[PDB]
Amino acid sequence: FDKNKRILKKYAKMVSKINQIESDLRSKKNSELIRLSMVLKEKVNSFEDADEHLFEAFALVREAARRTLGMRPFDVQVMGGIALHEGKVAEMKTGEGKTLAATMPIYLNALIGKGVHLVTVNDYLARRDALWMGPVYLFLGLRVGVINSLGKSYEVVWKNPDLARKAIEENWSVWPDGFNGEVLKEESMNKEAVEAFQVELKEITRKEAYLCDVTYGTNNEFGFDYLRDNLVLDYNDKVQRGHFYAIVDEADSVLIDEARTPLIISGPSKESPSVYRRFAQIAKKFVKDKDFTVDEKARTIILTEEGVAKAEKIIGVENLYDPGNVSLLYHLINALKALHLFKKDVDYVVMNGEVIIVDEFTGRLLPGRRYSGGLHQAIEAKEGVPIKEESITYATITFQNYFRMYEKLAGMTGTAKTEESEFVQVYGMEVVVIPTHKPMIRKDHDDLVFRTQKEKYEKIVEEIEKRYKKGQPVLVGTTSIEKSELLSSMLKKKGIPHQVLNAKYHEKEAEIVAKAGQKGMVTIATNMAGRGTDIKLGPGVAELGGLCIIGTERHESRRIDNQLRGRAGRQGDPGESIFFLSLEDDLLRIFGSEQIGKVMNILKIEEGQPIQHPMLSKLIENIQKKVEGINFSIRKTLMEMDDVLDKQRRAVYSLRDQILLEKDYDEYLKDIFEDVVSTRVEEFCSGKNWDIESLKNSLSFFPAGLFDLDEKQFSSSEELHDYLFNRLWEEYQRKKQEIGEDYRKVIRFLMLRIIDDHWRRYLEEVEHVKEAVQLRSYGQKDPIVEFKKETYYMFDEMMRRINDTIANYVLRV
């Protein structure tokens, strides 16, 4: 059946019922309305409870909006609101009222007391939307938070707290009593009340911005907060309170487009080359097999008791294995290993002062990149010259995997339907195409395809001239600054005044509004500049045919084109739209230039002119649609792999969180201590095996001696396990005794260190394998199976190394 019809049919009924309420509430006094919000706040405490009072809630919001901003939400805006509350992507054409529309569901689900996240694309839109919708929220007793870069969090407050109360106390409104239109007039609204409900920004802390009933921010910042939140050493330095309900504004932009590059926290090379080189020779003095042992089984180097001492005396620090000197320790291992374990031409080469190697000879030209963990820098230090800046990665996550954390996800755009597949396969969200408020009368012309770019751009500038002379305003869309700068040359060599836009949003939206709509105004916008800022038509301009959209080229995704296009018709406004193409454009270059090119020659054309026909326009659509196909498939494979990683990341973070919150590590240590002994017992001394020389060889990292193994009188493997563990756990207790109660903290710190360390090194390593599988999977274990299985082995090793590193640190300190 038709989902969009059934769903919509239901919404209609609902919106209808919300209308009957209005007559009950429009009569109420400002204090009565606030009292109702209070009753609702205590009545609505879960999702079940939210749908119960959704009628009352949505209606109340409407009124507060009619009295607070002068805007009375349209039926459609109430429709979209519901589609948000239901965890779907409400497709509402641009200039429809999404901002306001979102206010109703936001308010409703915000009464649960777990917070509500509104994500946009940038700072402006985050800050702007807040201040713009703030009064309504404040009026109903909600605290509105806002999160921007760099270290910026604010709280929308009344501009004149005293003045707002007069307006509530007394029954002030912006919308005069008795007006019964769908739209108030800027000319006729009680300025006494507009000025009363003015809102401004108040600098607050990050943590607090989230403790607000709702939180407005950028997709970037919400995610960054989460990653940072997993770099803490105190569960109290977190600035988030879980992930409850998030409405993603500009869904297609955040959840698909901005979402293809994974969110990263990159830093700079911590240590200096001076120290590497200083360790490059500190490492030439450690006598192999005395101060340490290498068992590249392969492949690690592990010190002995003579080596910990040399270094300690040498460095010289009281304790090598202590919380402060781990950097030192760590540095020593890289330098000690580099030349004692990578040799020379096995398989790296120093040619031209650059080290490069292997890869089993496909060939050694992996330049390709440097080794993980700062080992590479250690090699150059060894070879003589010279060390290069490295960039460490502390945390990563993709947007898909992030917004997936939220209990209820929701989004809204004017461009969602064409990509329903994606919202459903990635975020599990349906698209509900909300009808427009007023009829949509914008004339979308068939595309103009030219032979050559020169001809494309030359005939584009004729259009600008031709429409400018007429008085009709023009918004020209480009895809690079390069292309925007070029147009600007052309335009001014024929003396045509105009505005160019790219990326400083607070300012650009400022003119985008006055500029596109106002008579005889030309504006060039790069990459959807002035996004989200509504363009109102100027006086006399509607008769001219309204704003005229020019696409300098079609994008690889019809979405992006419909984003520029939707900018013109508006609320049944008149507007025009045309896309220029050339057989040399990338999209065309990618597909059908020649198939088109020939039809061009065959027909009476081409004169230096363009070919235009519905069937061609339609052809471009299919071709452009097919180019999206191949992308999404490609992209989805990457996604699957990203997910495979994400699952590990969760386990780690979830653990990190527990370590953060555990005051007693008695049980956790037992789990580590046992896994330390169990694995070494089950492989060396079990089934057909009873090799001990090798057992204590593997456990040699610990301080000799818990090494009282040579008095061997083991009857069975269970005795050995239980025993090995004993001397381990006894030591732990013997050590709980002296450090006293400051020990829980010391451990905690060490655990986080080790786990972060290994996590960051793991990720670096994993990347190589990601690419390894990607390129070499052909032809072809579904790349995921290779990756899932290979990534597994690696993670399993990481857990082993973490345990040994943890078990070993708590005992030596």
Ligand X SMILES: Nc1ncnc2c1ncn2[C@@H]1O[C@H](COP(=O)(O)OP(=O)(O)O)[C@@H](O)[C@H]1O
Detail the residues annotated as belonging to a binding site for ATP: 77, 95-99, 534
Name the residue whose CB lies closest to ligand X.
Answer: 98
Residues 6+ apart with CB under 8 A from 311: 282, 286, 303, 317, 320, 328, 332
| Structural contact between residues 534 and 71, judged by C-beta atoms closer than 8 angstroms | no
E strand residue ranges, 270-428 = 292-294, 301-303, 348-351, 354-357, 393-397, 408-413
Among positions 182-211, residues that touch ligand X (CB under 6 A) are: 183
Residue placing its CB nearer to Mg ion in the complex, 217 or 610: 217
Specify the residue, 134 or 307, whose C-beta has the smaller distance to ligand X.
Answer: 134
Residue 376's binding partner out of Mg ion, ligand X, none, with CB under 5 to 8 Å set by partner kind: none
Please say which residue, 83 or 92, places its beta carbon nearer to ligand X.
92
To the nearest whole angstrom, how small is the minimum distance from the Cβ of residue 95 to ligand X?
5
Interface region with Mg ion, contact rule CB under 5 A, candidates 97-105, 379-387, 442-450, 632-640? 97-105
How many residues contact ligand X, by CB under 6 A?
16
Secondary structure of residue 90 in the 3-state scheme? strand
DSSP classification of residue 259: G
Residue 155, contacted partner among Mg ion, ligand X, none, CB below 5-8 A by kind: none
Are 524 and 484 contacting, i.e. CB atoms less than 8 angstroms apart? Answer: yes
- Residue 128 CB, shortest distance to ligand X, in Å, is 9
| Of the candidate residues 419, 534, 628, 646, the single one contacting ligand X (CB under 6 A) | 534
The 3-state DSSP class for residue 117 equals strand
Nearer to ligand X, 77 or 499 (CB): 77
Q: How many angstroms separate the CA atoms of 518 and 261, rounded?
A: 38
Question: If binding is defined by CB under 5 A, does position 98 make contact with Mg ion?
Answer: yes
Contact 411, 247 (CB under 8 A): yes
CB of residue 682 vs Mg ion: minimum separation in angstroms? 59
CB nearer ligand X, residue 92 or residue 136: 92
**Taking the complex as a whole, how short is the minimal distance between the CB of residue 533 and Mg ion, in angstroms?**
9
88-127 footprint of ligand X as x/- string (CB under 6 A) = ----x-xxxxxxx---------------------------
Pair of tokens at residue 581: 């193409």
Considering the complex, what minimum distance in angstroms separates the CB of residue 407 from Mg ion? 23
Distance (Å, rounded) from C-alpha 234 to C-alpha 36? 40
What residues does 413 pair with on adjacent strands?
A: 91
Q: Which residues belong to the annotated binding site?
A: 77, 95-99, 534
Measuring CA to CA, which residue among 94, 158, 84, 148 is closest to residue 116? 84
Q: Toward ligand X, which CB reaches closer, 74 or 665? A: 74
* Partner in contact with 137, chosen from ligand X, Mg ion, none, beta carbon below 5 to 8 Å by kind: none
Among residues 532, 551, 575, 610, the one that binds Mg ion under rule CB under 5 A:
532
| CA 401 distance to own-chain centroid | 8
Question: What 3-state class would DSSP assign to 629?
Answer: helix
Give the span between the Cα atoms of 100 and 552, in whole angstroms: 32
Q: Compute the least distance from the CB of residue 208 to Mg ion, in Å.
A: 26
CB neighbours of 361 closer than 8 A, spacing ≥ 6? none
Is 80 or 532 the residue whose CB approaches Mg ion more closely?
532
Q: How far apart are CA 303 and CA 32, in angstroms?
A: 75
477 binds, among ligand X, Mg ion, none (CB under 5 to 8 A by kind): none
Contacts of 71 (CB under 8 A, 6+ apart): 65, 100, 184
Task: Give me the least distance between CB of 183 and ligand X, in Å please.
Answer: 5
Considering only residues 307-336, where is the footprint of Mg ion by CB under 5 A? Answer: none
**Separation between Cα atoms, residue 455 and residue 670, nearest integer Å:** 76
Where helices occur in 685-742 by DSSP H, the ranges are: 693-698, 717-739
Q: Of 94 and 648, which has the nearer Cβ to ligand X?
A: 94
161-169 vs 30-43: helix crossing angle, rounded to 10? 100
Q: CB under 5 to 8 A by kind: which of Mg ion, ligand X, none does 147 bind?
A: none
- Residue 404: Cβ-neighbour burial (10 angstroms; 0-12, 13-18, 19+): middle
568 burial (CB, 10 Å; 0-12 / 13-18 / 19+) is: buried
* CB 73, min distance to ligand X, A: 5
Q: Are 447 and 620 in contact (CB under 8 A)?
A: yes
Which of these ranges, 75-83, 93-101, 307-315, 650-658, lies near Mg ion under the rule CB under 5 A? 93-101
How many C-beta neighbours within 10 Å does residue 654 have?
Answer: 10
Shortest-Cβ-distance residue relative to Mg ion: 98
Question: Binding partner of residue 764 among Mg ion, ligand X, none, CB under 5 to 8 Å per kind?
Answer: none
Interface map 53-82 toward ligand X (x if CB under 6 A) = ------------------xxxx--x-----
Please, what is the minimum distance in Å from the beta carbon of residue 134 to ligand X?
14
**Which residues lie near ligand X (CB under 6 A)?**
71-74, 77, 92, 94-100, 183, 532, 534
Question: Which parts of this chain interact with Mg ion (CB under 5 A)?
Answer: 98, 532
